[PDB]
Design a protein around this nucleic acid. Structure first.
Ligand SMILES: Nc1ncnc2c1ncn2[C@@H]1O[C@H](COP(=O)(O)OP(=O)(O)OP(=O)(O)O)[C@@H](O)[C@H]1O
Length: 367
RNA sequence: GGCCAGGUAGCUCAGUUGGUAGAGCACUGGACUGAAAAUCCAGGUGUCGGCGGUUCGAUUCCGCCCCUGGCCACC
């Protein structure tokens, strides 16, 4: 219906950005980005009016958001910078060639992909390429983004883009960039399943040394990251109903050798979940003594008492130890699974004493 | 859209090793009165947001959502 309304208004609307990319990548998303030559606001208002849904106008930005079913629509007016601006001018201000393309929703040319910079070729060649040599200088945040994309889509930076990126990092532009955009970029990064590869790209171009103060790469942390990769794989395989956010674990591994001050400050900036802060504060101190207690574990009930109160994240961190691995697993798929019939429990009940008694019965069953 | 608080009576507010809930003023009833108020005895002051899951047992552990306020990402 968008092409129809745009036809009535004598306008030109287009699907633009990553939304296009994901379409060519086959991935279907509920968020669609529109670029409109002429006023996008009235188009969005009319579209929202015909479908009988609410509209969220932003005149100063010149963009309007409206939701139809599960679809989230954003209409934006064509702009040359972040006289009427052409579509080409609006696409050339973007980051990479794969994100620079567009698909016309206008009824006449409908279905046509509009690509000026050859982003289709780069998409087919798996290449992350900047539009202009000053790209990373303009927006240093992109330095992360590229890597992130190269992590997700398993693409490669072009020689141009790579040299330009390395130059951009060498100038320390990553420090000049707004802290918030960078932190948000990392937050976007850790949510990826291929995020480990993104971390490899972060190590290669050494951006984390720039962003995080006092951070340096070593081998033990890397091996811990691959071990955590395996553990995450297994846990998300068998226990997949129990899944949590895995990226935060990797983030904790990265900052493990860092000072508690810088760690707490960084996790503060990252707006990390509560369980992440708890798992970190537990990892920095009590984790060692906990492991030492797990080494002294003989009966299964002691293992129970030492494990069950802990979160899943702590357990996954405990699986990093080779000796503790099979123990943790045994606690997972076996130890904590058990129950009791009616009459028996009825005899058990005859306050806290019921709990202590139940514990005595459990340690009676285990050992 | 991300996160942090806040969610406890009608209103304004505390509560951690899971184990049988609280304050200040409104609420009912009776003693008291010509009526009413005060006051006394008392006692409702409540599925401690909603829905599932783990647990013998969840305000608490977790997951998904509702509401309100604040930090922002608001390309
Ligand atoms: N820093 C930037 N510089 C230039 N263009 C950008 C920048 N950030 C975003 N864009 C453009 O705006 C669009 C915003 O899309 P969005 O913010 O959802 O990110 P994305 O590329 O879609 O990845 P994701 O879906 O993971 O967020 C992108 O398609 C990109 O082309």
């Amino acid at each position: 219906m968008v092409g129809q309304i745009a036809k009535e208004m004598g306008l030109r609307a287009y699907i633009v950005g990553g939304v296009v990319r994901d379409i060519l990548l086959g991935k279907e998303v509920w968020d669609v980005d529109f670029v409109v030559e002429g006023n996008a606001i009235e188009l969005a208002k009319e579209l929202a009016r015909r479908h009988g849904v609410n509209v969220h106008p932003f005149p100063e930005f010149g963009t309007a958001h409206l939701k139809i079913g599960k679809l989230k629509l954003e209409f934006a007016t064509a702009r040359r910078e972040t006289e009427p601006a052409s579509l080409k001018e609006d696409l050339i201000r973007r980051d990479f060639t794969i994100n620079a393309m567009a698909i016309s929703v206008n009824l006449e040319d409908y279905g046509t992909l509009i690509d000026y910079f050859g982003g289709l070729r780069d998409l087919k060649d798996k290449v992350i390429r900047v539009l202009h040599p000053v790209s990373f200088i303009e927006d240093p945040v992109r330095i992360l983004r590229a890597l992130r994309f190269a992590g997700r889509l398993n693409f490669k930076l072009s020689r141009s883009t790579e040299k330009l990126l390395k130059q951009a990092v060498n100038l320390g532009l990553l420090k000049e960039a707004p802290r918030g955009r960078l932190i948000n970029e990392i937050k976007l990064a850790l949510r990826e399943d291929r995020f480990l590869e993104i971390l490899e790209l972060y190590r290669k171009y050494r951006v984390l040394e720039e962003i995080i103060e006092g951070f340096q790469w070593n081998e033990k942390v890397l091996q811990k990251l691959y071990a955590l990769r395996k553990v995450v794989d297994w846990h998300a395989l068998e226990f997949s109903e129990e899944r949590i956010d895995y990226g935060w674990l990797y983030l904790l591994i990265l900052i493990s050798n860092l000072d508690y001050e810088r760690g707490k400050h960084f996790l503060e900036e990252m707006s990390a979940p509560s369980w992440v802060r708890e798992t970190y504060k537990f990892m920095k101190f009590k984790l060692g003594s906990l492991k030492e207690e797990l080494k002294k574990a003989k009966e299964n009930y002691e293992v129970y008492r030492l494990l069950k109160p802990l979160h899943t994240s702590v357990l996954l961190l405990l699986m990093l130890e080779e000796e503790l691995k099979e123990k943790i697993k045994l606690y997972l798929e076996k130890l904590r699974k058990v129950k009791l019939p009616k009459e028996k429990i009825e005899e058990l009940k005859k306050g806290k004493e019921l709990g202590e008694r139940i514990e005595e019965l459990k340690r009676e069953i285990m050992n």
